[PDB]
Design an enzyme around this catalytic site. Structure first.
Site, PDB file in Angstrom:
ATOM      1  N   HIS A 132     -13.431  -0.879  -8.967  1.00  0.00           N
ATOM      2  CA  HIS A 132     -12.144  -0.716  -8.632  1.00  0.00           C
ATOM      3  C   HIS A 132     -11.631  -1.655  -7.652  1.00  0.00           C
ATOM      4  O   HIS A 132     -10.573  -1.912  -7.463  1.00  0.00           O
ATOM      5  CB  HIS A 132     -11.818   0.803  -8.013  1.00  0.00           C
ATOM      6  CG  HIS A 132     -10.343   1.199  -7.299  1.00  0.00           C
ATOM      7  ND1 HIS A 132      -9.346   0.947  -8.200  1.00  0.00           N
ATOM      8  CD2 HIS A 132     -10.109   1.438  -6.061  1.00  0.00           C
ATOM      9  CE1 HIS A 132      -8.388   1.130  -7.434  1.00  0.00           C
ATOM     10  NE2 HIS A 132      -8.683   1.419  -6.290  1.00  0.00           N
ATOM     11  N   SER A 162      -4.430  -0.291  -6.090  1.00  0.00           N
ATOM     12  CA  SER A 162      -4.242   1.081  -6.006  1.00  0.00           C
ATOM     13  C   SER A 162      -2.949   1.727  -5.520  1.00  0.00           C
ATOM     14  O   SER A 162      -2.069   1.695  -6.759  1.00  0.00           O
ATOM     15  CB  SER A 162      -5.160   1.566  -4.696  1.00  0.00           C
ATOM     16  OG  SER A 162      -6.449   0.476  -4.876  1.00  0.00           O
ATOM     17  N   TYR A 163      -2.639   2.324  -4.746  1.00  0.00           N
ATOM     18  CA  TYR A 163      -1.316   2.831  -4.405  1.00  0.00           C
ATOM     19  C   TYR A 163      -0.226   1.833  -4.495  1.00  0.00           C
ATOM     20  O   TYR A 163       0.706   2.221  -4.836  1.00  0.00           O
ATOM     21  CB  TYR A 163      -1.429   3.711  -3.037  1.00  0.00           C
ATOM     22  CG  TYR A 163      -0.413   4.697  -2.921  1.00  0.00           C
ATOM     23  CD1 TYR A 163      -0.562   6.219  -2.954  1.00  0.00           C
ATOM     24  CD2 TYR A 163       1.036   4.379  -2.531  1.00  0.00           C
ATOM     25  CE1 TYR A 163       0.473   7.100  -3.001  1.00  0.00           C
ATOM     26  CE2 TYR A 163       2.119   5.195  -2.220  1.00  0.00           C
ATOM     27  CZ  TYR A 163       1.656   6.548  -2.487  1.00  0.00           C
ATOM     28  OH  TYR A 163       2.858   7.665  -2.354  1.00  0.00           O
ATOM     29  N   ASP A 190     -13.615   1.022 -13.777  1.00  0.00           N
ATOM     30  CA  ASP A 190     -13.338   1.318 -12.483  1.00  0.00           C
ATOM     31  C   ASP A 190     -13.258   2.910 -12.555  1.00  0.00           C
ATOM     32  O   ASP A 190     -12.558   3.480 -13.449  1.00  0.00           O
ATOM     33  CB  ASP A 190     -11.543   1.202 -12.512  1.00  0.00           C
ATOM     34  CG  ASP A 190     -11.138   1.307 -11.177  1.00  0.00           C
ATOM     35  OD1 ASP A 190     -11.133   2.595 -10.760  1.00  0.00           O
ATOM     36  OD2 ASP A 190     -10.076   0.506 -10.731  1.00  0.00           O
ATOM     37  N   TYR A 250       1.093  -0.904  -0.115  1.00  0.00           N
ATOM     38  CA  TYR A 250      -0.010   0.095   0.092  1.00  0.00           C
ATOM     39  C   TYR A 250       1.022   1.149   0.160  1.00  0.00           C
ATOM     40  O   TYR A 250       1.383   1.687  -1.077  1.00  0.00           O
ATOM     41  CB  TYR A 250      -0.934  -0.159   1.297  1.00  0.00           C
ATOM     42  CG  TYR A 250      -1.862   1.129   1.388  1.00  0.00           C
ATOM     43  CD1 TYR A 250      -2.041   2.370   0.302  1.00  0.00           C
ATOM     44  CD2 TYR A 250      -2.765   1.193   2.544  1.00  0.00           C
ATOM     45  CE1 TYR A 250      -2.619   3.503   0.573  1.00  0.00           C
ATOM     46  CE2 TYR A 250      -3.505   2.434   2.799  1.00  0.00           C
ATOM     47  CZ  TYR A 250      -3.551   3.706   1.650  1.00  0.00           C
ATOM     48  OH  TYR A 250      -4.030   4.526   1.564  1.00  0.00           O
TER      49      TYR A 250
HETATM   50  C1  LIG Z   1      -4.245  -0.290  -1.367  1.00  0.00           C
HETATM   51  N1  LIG Z   1      -5.361   0.917  -1.008  1.00  0.00           N
HETATM   52  C2  LIG Z   1      -6.127   0.926  -0.267  1.00  0.00           C
HETATM   53  O1  LIG Z   1      -6.541  -0.147   0.474  1.00  0.00           O
HETATM   54  C3  LIG Z   1      -6.465   2.532  -0.051  1.00  0.00           C
HETATM   55  N2  LIG Z   1      -7.715   3.269   0.610  1.00  0.00           N
HETATM   56  C4  LIG Z   1      -7.238   4.457   0.047  1.00  0.00           C
HETATM   57  N3  LIG Z   1      -8.020   5.830   0.368  1.00  0.00           N
HETATM   58  C5  LIG Z   1      -8.258   5.712   1.741  1.00  0.00           C
HETATM   59  C6  LIG Z   1      -8.800   7.184   2.212  1.00  0.00           C
HETATM   60  C7  LIG Z   1     -10.146   7.470   1.299  1.00  0.00           C
HETATM   61  C8  LIG Z   1      -9.836   7.340  -0.048  1.00  0.00           C
HETATM   62  N4  LIG Z   1     -10.904   7.278  -1.036  1.00  0.00           N
HETATM   63  C9  LIG Z   1      -9.132   5.886  -0.240  1.00  0.00           C
HETATM   64  N5  LIG Z   1      -6.114   4.560  -0.781  1.00  0.00           N
HETATM   65  C10 LIG Z   1      -5.766   5.609  -1.541  1.00  0.00           C
HETATM   66  C11 LIG Z   1      -5.621   5.485  -3.047  1.00  0.00           C
HETATM   67  C12 LIG Z   1      -4.164   5.834  -3.457  1.00  0.00           C
HETATM   68  C13 LIG Z   1      -3.774   5.822  -4.862  1.00  0.00           C
HETATM   69  C14 LIG Z   1      -5.154   5.376  -5.609  1.00  0.00           C
HETATM   70  C15 LIG Z   1      -6.159   4.861  -5.218  1.00  0.00           C
HETATM   71  C16 LIG Z   1      -6.360   5.185  -4.008  1.00  0.00           C
HETATM   72  C17 LIG Z   1      -7.840   4.529  -3.523  1.00  0.00           C
HETATM   73  N6  LIG Z   1      -8.891   4.170  -3.189  1.00  0.00           N
HETATM   74  C18 LIG Z   1      -5.678   3.023  -0.753  1.00  0.00           C
HETATM   75  C19 LIG Z   1      -4.708   2.124  -1.656  1.00  0.00           C
HETATM   76  O2  LIG Z   1      -4.044   2.545  -2.382  1.00  0.00           O
END
Ligand SMILES: CN1C(=O)c2[nH]c(N3CCC[C@H](N)C3)[n+](Cc3ccccc3C#N)c2C1=O
Lengths: 730, 730
Positions: A704, A594-595, A672, A511
């Site tokens: 997504h 995602s991230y 997505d 992550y």
């Molecule tokens: C793996 N992963 C994960 O579980 C989570 N939760 C979140 N955010 C938490 C706060 C609310 C927000 N909406 C989502 N992100 C941030 C993100 C970063 C870059 C691209 C897409 C996302 C999306 N979703 C991520 C992850 O990357």
């Protein structure tokens, strides 16, 4: 002598129980048992049927959910649930009159409601339909339309637009009933100048021409939606055809340019708390507003302004924390970084005070996760203070009148099994249920707040425990490695009879986005479980820089430059693991969603040599592609006058070449709406131009989360085979 | 001792030459040599510089092409070529005055022209720009707007809409100058009711928001574009501001319902030939229209109607064959199916004759491929008559005055090297160049039409031959297997020192759509060459039912039911091959593009067990997804009143289950406007629901041809590795 099969995972063979109750008062709670809503007396197991196995079957098997009115006189029955985005969805509703014992049938509620909710008091209802807000003073009475400007993808009344639902509030809801329910506050968003993204939807193979879904989505630097706040007097409705909502305008220090509405919180019934944020989340203001009886207007005097700032990065973890006011709303406690960069609790006065607005009630190299409840004498919170484990969670409590009187309430309990707690106090903290998510199998117990006496055990996964007996489960080490003189925690899911002498293949789980935490003390049964119990693969996660709850020095380290330190540290950690001996350097992989998919891609494309293969699911490929609220928080604006350079330098496609030295699996959902596929399509194009072979997989009409049952199973099966091929197993 | 590497293919290492000339008269021709246009004298090698290495460089290196006016006074210089669909594209033009020795610069031609062309006579130009037709009587003079109804994606004047371009005519052009160029006939299409398909385009990674391309595309059963035919008097233009075009209306037997314009052909300058087809290509009518000088109108008396029918399937191969009139246009010769179902040449009279409109000039269990030229005494044509080889091509010639005096002019020449000829006669068949595409390296020679004396050899690939000397080239058997007492031809690309006793892995190659021919005597250097030469894989093709030029019995056998006989026969053939001994039954694969992808998928999903793996590139998964003109021609309308059942029964997604017994690679372009991706997306979804793992690969912004340099290389590399993994090679 059986292992944990991918099938165990995918088919949810070993179910993990919990005890999700609903406090209806300071001493009774509701609980769903075999599709029966039971009312329990906290104290003596004294139970009682509230709603029957029955009732729910009237609306057949489509009864999505239920909501009991606070005065326990009615029950909202949700059905025909149709999802849309992370929290949004539309459903049909029915109001069951408990007393008269039957479904109210008169002034029914629209069959395509976007959101509904009881007041905090009696049985008042507020719901959004066709983007407009409506009110029913009582279930039998007719609707009173509150707004009429509502329009799809343009004007949102009482519900959030896309970016607001995903990045500002955690829900679709933008309505806030006042205590005693006189007023109803609500936000209005104008998605007018906001650009549109338009993906295709194929639906059943019977649809001849695919559909096009358009969504007003602001990508980094684009025009954002605008806001407006309103409070309408709910009492007057019966004496008018229309009521005129009074509008609160954002603080002066925020209106000069683009901004956001952060948080809404009713203090008393003549006082409301609003938090605003500038587009560059450098600055934030929390205005306290008072209702003027005479001029029938809300005033937000700058004297009750309260400013929050950050010279290191952004405000809050993902936004300013929420205020918690005293009974008389004269003061409020809020979590804010202290002089050392640690998120802690400090007191505030309604009126601001020249550079002393705060008085910290917590100190230390640890952070307060959340404020759970505020009594007239106690403040219950949750922190990762105990045993210095940032990845652990425990419930604390401080006596207002004596800050020295601070005591942990979960630390003793089950130090072995429980190191990660979730709490849930009754309406006035007379009782409190604890959710042990801790290392061991989750354990739920409720206690009497006074002395902490554990009244009883609500749920101990004995059932699950007896089953996991015949299975060889992996273990989980949660320790910390140390770099440049700092603790950086990590965790490992070690396959069964893990022999520290042998050499196992390593799979990094990522992550690593701002304020993330992959290394914690919580129990889980996921694909990592299978990978270890059956494929003998070690799955490890590493919280490096820009991460978790360990102070702003660590979290802000990434500011203005994503795709940097958090990626490196991830590689560094893999090296450190290798130095730990039991890792077969010739078989190390890394994957992420995602991230995590972004970092996985940035790592595989670093040409560090350390990794053999990797899988990125719905990754982000360059920050101009992602939304504004999230991206800008950490990256600023993609303009030359700001951070365009770091935006362009942190691209995935710019590392295409380095992919020749790696097996890569790029997966992505067709529908997505969060991470647009455009991101993966751009990656694949870069790789094709570079002449780099790789593997891809699209998921038709998937979200997504690619979470529809079949897709879910298919994507993990496809990823499992990828690793087996890559690790020369299978 | 070197093999034919995949790099040899992808990098076009061994270039194959040809002699593409342009007959400027009945005795001279143009030929491009080292970017110099040379005029040659057929008879004596007598050559001469027409246009220099020069000229072209003025417009830099963007000079896409050139067109020399028929009166050899001017040259059209094309540049800024931008593709759009199979044949459409827009360019910029310059007129170079040969005589005045410089580029005309006055009334220039618009910088975004969709199509241009000289008159058949002098230097008259007609061009479409912004969907409207323009005329320039001479290169220096100003444009004369002929239409003004032109509108993007709505009204097409002088150019074809999507479906017409792809399925009816083979180009973008819908203009037809008359001989002597008095009139200019054109078609107009209204895409109004035609539905839209909208795919995404990502462009450079710099584009923040992807584009959307919409195209009026009629899928099977949908509303089609409409047609209108006009002829405008090109002489009047200088005496008016606007000229009024006269319209010809389709024949009554075609107007009751949906129909299409088939073919346009000027007879004399007062007579034009038009062919019309009903939406259900069961029926076709060829009207001959005469110009009335008195009432200044065109007349198409039913007396000159001429009907073409088919009770077995559709008309013609892909539409009614083109008429070839005598000098005085009193009669015409056209290929049509004789009583036995064989496409042959027969005579017609301007006026129809009660069930005797035809007199066949050819007979036999073989077919006439095309009518190449019609002299006052001779009719030159191409057929697959020789040696009973349907897959062979030879130039013949019959004496009108005597249908006995029928002689082959290519059969003798090089029976070893040549069996597949292409022809090209001068303006009046005084000379004729032959294109030996035959078994051996392609050979180009020109002959004096009188006695056939081969004046000289224009091109014999000796250069290439010298090179292939140091390489282990595969061979190619072109034979026939016999099923249900019928000959069914096939071909095999046998690897080098192919030893009939050993066992090699087999790769079926497929198209197998109506009237296709994968088994022929033409030389080629493709991916199949690599596979045999370096991977030792036998690549084989088989023309089964519904195929080639072997009579309607065989071609129509598929009528109203695609995804049937042609799929089975393909499997059968594989079996037959295995029975030939030298095939390793444990390593048989099958791939295909377009229709071939469909069959490949229909085969892999047949659960016949005969195949191990397969690849389908941009396949068709169900016929409702493909365009009208093509689909309906063989499937009729997807309605319950017609063929709905067969449409639904011939789906690929309906065989998802059988794919568990197969490794499958599905590839598809992102910007595919021909086969919509919707098709692959629908397949992947079916397999995901079926719990079947498979491999996929999308190509960002790639066409239906995935022919962009990097993509082209990437896709073949990716497929190669797929087979290597599948055949346990690599
Ligand atoms: C793996 N992963 C994960 O579980 C989570 N939760 C979140 N955010 C938490 C706060 C609310 C927000 N909406 C989502 N992100 C941030 C993100 C970063 C870059 C691209 C897409 C996302 C999306 N979703 C991520 C992850 O990357």
């Amino acid at each position: 002598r059986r292992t944990y099969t991918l099938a165990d995972y995918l088919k949810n063979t070993f179910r993990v129980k919990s005890y999700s109750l609903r406090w209806v008062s300071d001493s009774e709670y509701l609980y769903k048992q075999e599709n029966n809503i039971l009312l329990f007396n906290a104290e003596h197991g004294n139970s009682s049927i509230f709603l029957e196995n029955s009732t729910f079957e009237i609306f057949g098997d489509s009864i999505s959910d239920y909501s009991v009115s606070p005065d326990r006189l009615f029950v909202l029955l949700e059905y025909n649930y149709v999802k849309q985005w992370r929290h949004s969805y539309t459903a049909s509703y029915s109001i069951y009159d408990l007393n008269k014992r039957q479904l109210i049938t008169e002034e029914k509620i629209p069959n395509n409601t976007q959101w509904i909710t009881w007041s905090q008091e009696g049985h008042k209802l507020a719901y959004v339909w066709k983007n407009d807000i409506y009110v029913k003073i009582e279930p039998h009475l007719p609707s009173h339309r509150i707004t009429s400007t509502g329009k799809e993808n343009v004007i949102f009344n009482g519900i959030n637009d896309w970016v607001y639902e995903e990045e500002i509030f955690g829900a679709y809801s933008a309505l806030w009933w006042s205590p005693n329910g006189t007023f109803l506050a609500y936000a209005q968003f104008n998605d007018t100048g906001v650009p549109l993204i338009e993906y295709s939807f194929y639906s059943d193979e019977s649809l001849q021409y695919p559909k096009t879904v358009w969504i007003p989505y602001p990508k980094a630097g684009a025009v954002n939606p605008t806001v407006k706040f309103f409070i309408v007097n709910t009492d007057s409705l019966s004496s008018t055809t229309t009521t005129i909502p009074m509008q609160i305008t954002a603080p002066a220090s925020v209106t000069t340019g683009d901004h956001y509405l952060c948080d809404v919180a009713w203090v008393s019934e003549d006082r409301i708390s609003l938090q605003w944020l500038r587009r560059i989340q450098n600055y934030s203001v929390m205005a306290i507003c008072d209702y003027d009886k005479t001029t029938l207007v809300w005033n937000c005097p700058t004297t009750q302004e309260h400013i929050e700032t950050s010279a290191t990065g952004w405000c809050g973890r993902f936004r300013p924390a929420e205020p918690h006011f005293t009974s008389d709303g004269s003061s409020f406690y809020k979590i804010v970084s202290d002089k050392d960069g640690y998120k802690h609790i400090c007191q505030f006065q309604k009126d601001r005070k020249p550079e002393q607005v705060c008085t910290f009630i917590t100190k230390g190299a640890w952070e307060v996760i959340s404020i759970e409840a505020l009594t007239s004498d106690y403040l219950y919170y949750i922190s990762n203070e105990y045993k210095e484990m940032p990845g652990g969670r425990n419930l604390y409590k401080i006596q207002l009148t004596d800050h020295t009187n601070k005591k942990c309430l979960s630390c003793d309990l089950n130090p072995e099994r429980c190191q990660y707690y979730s709490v849930s106090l009754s309406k006035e903290a007379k009782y409190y249920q604890l959710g042990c998510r801790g290392p061991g199998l989750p354990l739920y117990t409720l206690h009497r707040s006074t002395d902490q006496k554990e009244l009883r055990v609500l749920e101990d996964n004995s059932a699950l425990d007896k089953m996991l007996q015949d299975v060889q489960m992996p273990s989980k080490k949660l320790d910390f490695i140390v770099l440049n003189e700092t603790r950086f925690w990590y965790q490992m899911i070690l396959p069964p009879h893990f022999d520290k002498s042998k050499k196992y293949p390593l799979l990094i789980d990522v992550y690593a986005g701002p304020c993330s935490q992959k290394a914690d003390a919580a129990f889980r049964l996921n694909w990592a479980t299978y990978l270890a119990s059956t494929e003998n693969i070690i799955v490890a996660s590493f919280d490096g820089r820009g991460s978790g709850y360990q102070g702003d020095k660590i979290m802000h380290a990434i500011n203005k430059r994503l795709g940097t330190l958090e990626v490196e540290d991830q590689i560094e950690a893999a090296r450190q693991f290798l130095k730990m001996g039991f890792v077969d350097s010739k078989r190390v992989a890394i994957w992420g969603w995602s991230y995590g998919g972004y970092v996985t891609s940035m790592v595989l494309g670093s040409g560090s040599g350390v990794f053999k293969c990797g899988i990125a699911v719905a990754p982000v490929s360059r920050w101009e592609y992602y939304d504004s609220v999230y991206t800008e928080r950490y990256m600023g604006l993609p303009t030359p006058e700001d951070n365009l350079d770091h935006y362009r330098n942190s691209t995935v496609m710019s590392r295409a070449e380095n992919f020749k030295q790696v097996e890569y699996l790029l997966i992505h959902g067709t529908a997505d709406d969060n991470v647009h596929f455009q991101q993966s399509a751009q990656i694949s194009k870069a790789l094709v131009d570079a002449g780099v072979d790789f593997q891809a997989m699209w998921y038709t009409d998937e979200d997504h989360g690619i979470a529809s049952s079949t897709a879910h199973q298919h994507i993990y099966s496809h990823m499992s085979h990828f690793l087996q091929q890559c690790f020369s197993l299978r």
